Nucleic acid binder design. Structure first.
Ligand SMILES: [Mn+2]
Lengths: 84, 99, 95, 105, 97, 78, 102, 92
DNA sequence: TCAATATCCACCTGCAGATTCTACCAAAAGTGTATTTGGAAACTGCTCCATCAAAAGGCATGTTCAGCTGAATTCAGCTGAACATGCCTTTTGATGGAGCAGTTTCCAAATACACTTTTGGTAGAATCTGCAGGTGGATATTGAT
DNA sequence: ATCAATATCCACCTGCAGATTCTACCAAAAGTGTATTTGGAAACTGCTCCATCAAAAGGCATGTTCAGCTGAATTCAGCTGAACATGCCTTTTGATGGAGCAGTTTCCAAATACACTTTTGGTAGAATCTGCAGGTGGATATTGA
C-alpha cells in the first residue's frame, strides 16, 4: 500500500482545542498542541501495544474490539460499549 | 460594523457547545491512519476491526478531555487562565502517569 | 454455522419497562448496560472469589457474595443491594 | 416450570449467573443461593441506573435512553459516580461545567 | 545570641528525616486513633499488635506521598508554603476527592 | 482522640515529603485526610475480619484492605 | 524438579499454588516451571541491586531501606512496584531546587 | 505449617552476593514481593486463557502475561530465563 | 573572610538482640499406571476488512489586528520558623489472666454429577416510529454609540 | 442608558435508519436419582492480647521575636483569540476481491486421577555476629560584623 509517516500531525490543532473546550479550557497556551500530541502518542502506543499483544496470543492477524477493551482494562481505563 | 466578539466570548461559547454534545472531536480518518501507523510499528501486516479503531478513539478522546480538566485546574491553581505544558506536566505527575 | 452470543438485553429491557413503561433504549445504550452488568458481575464474583481463599474455604456461598457487595458497593447503594439480595434468597429457599 | 429466577422473584437469569460463576473459576464450588443473591444485586444496580437514566431522558424530552443520558445519570449520583469512577462511557460526553473564574467579569 | 536564619533548620530537618526510615507519628496516640475508629464499625475488637503496625506504616507512608504532591502543587502556584488548598488539588487530581 | 496526631509530627511527615514551609491551617486539614484514610482502610479491614467470624483483627486483614484501596503494603505477610 | 530446571525456586510449590489457585481448569507442565524462573530471576534482580545498596552504606545485611533504595532508583522496578509501599523504607533523598538557598 | 519463599530468596541472595545477608523484615518484604508478582502473572495468564476459551494455563500464557505485565528490559530478560528454564526441564 | 556558633561525620569500641546454623519429624513433591480430553492440524463457509472511485462542501490553514493576560516588579503587613522553657504523656517492661484464634472428629445438609426432558433466548425477517436535520420567529446576550 | 448584530432557544415537520416484534430451532436451564464432600458444632488448647502498675526522658506545648514570604497593586510587551478568505481532504456511498475469522471434525500429545514411596522444608533449640549506641576531635556549613 502506502508509507505511513508523521501521522501524529493528523491531530489538527483545531481539534485539540475542541478536546480542550469540552474539557473546560478557555485559554490555550501555544506550546500546548505539540505537548498534547506527545501524550496522545504515548497513551495510544501503550493501549495499542497491549491490544496487539492480546491479538498475537490468540494467533490472529486482526485487532478485535475486545483486544482493545481488555487492553484499556489493564491500563485501568475501563471502556463500556464495545464488547459487552 | 464590523461586529467583533471580545476575546473569551467565543471560547466560552465553545466550552458550552462542546460539553452539551458527545460527538468525537478528532477527525475519524487522521486518527485511523495514526493508529495504523503506530500499530504497524509493533507488528507489520495487521488488520483492524472497524470498531477496534472506534474504541481506541473513544478512549483516547475521553482520556485527553479528562486530562485537560485536571490540566485546567492546575492553571487556575497558579492563578492563570491559560493552560500551558507546565500545567499538563504537573497533572500527569500528580496522577502517576510519569512521576 | 450460527454462533449464538448471549447478553443481558432481555433482562435489562424487562427492568427498564418496570421503571419506565413509556421509555425505550437504543442499540448503543443497551451495549453500555450490557458492559455495566458484566463488569459489576466480574467485580462481585472476583471479590467473593478472593474472600473464600483468604479463608481457605473451597466454596462461594451467598454469604461471600454479600461481603463482596459491602466491600465493593459504596453507601446506600450497598444497603439497598444487600437488602434486595437477601429478600431474593430467603424467598428462593421457601420456594 | 419454576425457573430459579421466578422462585426468587427476580427478573435477571438466576441460572445464567450460577453457570457463569461455576465456569469463571472463582471457586471450586458454588452455593445454591449465591447466583440468586448476586443476580438480584445486578438487577437492583441495573434498575438503579435505568431509573436515573430514564429520567435524564425525560428531562431532555426524549422517549429513548441514549448513552449520554446514562452518563448524565452516573455522573450526577455521587455513589454511581464512584462505583464507575474509572469507567469510560462511549458516546457519553461530560457533565456541563465551567470553572467560575473563567466566566465573564 | 546565635540564631539560625528562618528556614535553615527546615532543610536540615528534611535532610535528617529523609535519611531515616523510623516511623514519625507517636505510636500510642495512633494506636488509640485506630481502636477508636474501628470501634465505630465493630465492638470488643482486638487488633493484633502487628495489624496496628501495618496501619501505621501504610497510613504514614501515604501522608508523606500526599505531601510530596502537595509540595509540587504549592511550588506550581509560585509559592513555597504548603497550604490546605494545595493538598486539596493534589487529592482532587489523584482521584481521591 | 484524633487530635493525638500532634502538629509537630505532621511537620515531621511533611519534612520527609520535602516540605520546607508549612501553613498553619494544614495541621487540621492533614488530620482530616489522615482520618478519612484510616476510616476507609479499617472499614474494609474489619469487614474482612467479621466475615472470618473473628473478633481479633489480624495484620492480613489490614493488608487485604490496603490492597483494595490500591495502597498495597509489603513485608507484613509474615 | 526445580533442580531439573536449574532453579532455586520450587517448581512444584508453584505448580501446587497454580492448580489450587482457581486460575484455570488445568495447569500445563511447563507453566509452573516458566513462572518459577521468572519469580527467581526478578528476585535476583532486586537482591543484586539491594546488595550493592548494602555495601554502599558499609553494611553487610540487607534491610528494608536497602530494597527501597534499590527499587526506587531503577526506573523499571520502580514502575513495576509503583503502587507498592515498602514497610520501613523511607523516601529517596530529594529536595526541590526552588527550596534551596540563593 | 505456614510456608514461604524465605528459604529460596536466601539461596538466590547467596548466588548474587555470597558475603551479604538479609534482615528479618527485609526478608519479609522480599517474601511479599514474590507473592504479589506471582499473583499478577497468574491472574493475568488466568485471563488470557479465559478470553481465548481455553481451560488450561500453559507456559505460553505465563509468557504473554509477562510481556503485558513487566516493563521494558525486565520483560525481555524475564522472558528468556522463563524460556531458558523450560528448555532445560524438557531436555532431561 | 574572619570568627564564634552549632552541627554533622568518620574512627573505634563493646554486648545483646537478632541472624544463621543444626537437628529431626509431617506434608508434600515425585513415581508408576490407567484415564480423560482439550485444542492443534485440517478444511472451509462467508462476514468483514482493505481498497478504489467521485463528488462536494465541511474545515484546517494562514495572515491580520489588537484585546487583555501573564510576567515582571514594587511594597509592607503579618504569618509562622527558630528558640529557650516547663511539664506530662509516651516508652517499656514485665507479669498475669483470659478471650480467642486454631485443631480435631463426627457427620447432616448441601453440592456435585450424569442424563433426560422442556423451555427460554438468540438469530433473522417483518412492522413500526423516534427524532436527526432543517426551517423560522422569539429570545436573550454582546458589543458599539 | 440605547440598539443593532448574532448566536441560541424551542416548537414543529416528516420520512427512514434504527428499534420493536414475531417466529422458529436448540443450546441450556431444569427435574431426579445417586455419589461425594464440606464446613460447621462441641472440645480444648497454647496463644497472643489487654490490663494495670510505675517509674524517667524524651517530646509536646507555649510565649517571644521578627525574617522574608505571601498578596495586593501596577505596568506593559506581546501572546493568543476572533475573523475571514483559501481550496484541501475528510466524508459519504457503493462495489468488490479475498484475507482470515470461526464452526466442525479428527485424535493424539498431554494434563488428571489415584494410591505409594521418598525427601524437603518448617520448627525450635543452639552457636554466631552485625549494628546499635556513645564517645571524641576536627572539619563543615551558617551567620554576624
Ligand atoms: Mn512505521
Amino acid at each position: 500500500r502506502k508509507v505511513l509517516r508523521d501521522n501524529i500531525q493528523g491531530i489538527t490543532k483545531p481539534a485539540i482545542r475542541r478536546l480542550a473546550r469540552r474539557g473546560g479550557v478557555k485559554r490555550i497556551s501555544g506550546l500546548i498542541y505539540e505537548e498534547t500530541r506527545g501524550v496522545l502518542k504515548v497513551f495510544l502506543e501503550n493501549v495499542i501495544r497491549d491490544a496487539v499483544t492480546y491479538t498475537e496470543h490468540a494467533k490472529r492477524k486482526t485487532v478485535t474490539a475486545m483486544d482493545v477493551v481488555y487492553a484499556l482494562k489493564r491500563q485501568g481505563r475501563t471502556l463500556y460499549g464495545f464488547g459487552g | 460594523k464590523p461586529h467583533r466578539y471580545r476575546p473569551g466570548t467565543v471560547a466560552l461559547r465553545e466550552i458550552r457547545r462542546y460539553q452539551k454534545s458527545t460527538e468525537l472531536l478528532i477527525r475519524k480518518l487522521p486518527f485511523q491512519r495514526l493508529v495504523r501507523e503506530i500499530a504497524q510499528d509493533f507488528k507489520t501486516d495487521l488488520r483492524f476491526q472497524s470498531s477496534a479503531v472506534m474504541a481506541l478513539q473513544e478512549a483516547c478522546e475521553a482520556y485527553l478531555v479528562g486530562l485537560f480538566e485536571d490540566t485546567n485546574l492546575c492553571a487556575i491553581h497558579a492563578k492563570r487562565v491559560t493552560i500551558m505544558p507546565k500545567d499538563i506536566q504537573l497533572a500527569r505527575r500528580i496522577r502517576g502517569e510519569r512521576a | 454455522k450460527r454462533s449464538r452470543k448471549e447478553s443481558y438485553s432481555i433482562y435489562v429491557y424487562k427492568v427498564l419497562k418496570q421503571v419506565h413503561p413509556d421509555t425505550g433504549i437504543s442499540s448503543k445504550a443497551m451495549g453500555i448496560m450490557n458492559s455495566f452488568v458484566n463488569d459489576i458481575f466480574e467485580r462481585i464474583a472476583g471479590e467473593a472469589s478472593r474472600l473464600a481463599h483468604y479463608n481457605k474455604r473451597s466454596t462461594i456461598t451467598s454469604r461471600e457474595i454479600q461481603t463482596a457487595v459491602r466491600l465493593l458497593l459504596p453507601g446506600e447503594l450497598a444497603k439497598h443491594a444487600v437488602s434486595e439480595g437477601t429478600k431474593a434468597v430467603t424467598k428462593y429457599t421457601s420456594a | 416450570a419454576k425457573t430459579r429466577s421466578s422462585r426468587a422473584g427476580l427478573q435477571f437469569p438466576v441460572g445464567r449467573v450460577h453457570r457463569l460463576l461455576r465456569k469463571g473459576n472463582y471457586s471450586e464450588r458454588v452455593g445454591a443461593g449465591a447466583p440468586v443473591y448476586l443476580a438480584a444485586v445486578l438487577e437492583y444496580l441495573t434498575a438503579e441506573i435505568l431509573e436515573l437514566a430514564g429520567n435524564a431522558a425525560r428531562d431532555n424530552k426524549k422517549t429513548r435512553i441514549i448513552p449520554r443520558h446514562l452518563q448524565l445519570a452516573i455522573r450526577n449520583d455521587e455513589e454511581l459516580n464512584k462505583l464507575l469512577g474509572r469507567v469510560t462511557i462511549a458516546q457519553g460526553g461530560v457533565l456541563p461545567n465551567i470553572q467560575a473564574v473563567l466566566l465573564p467579569k
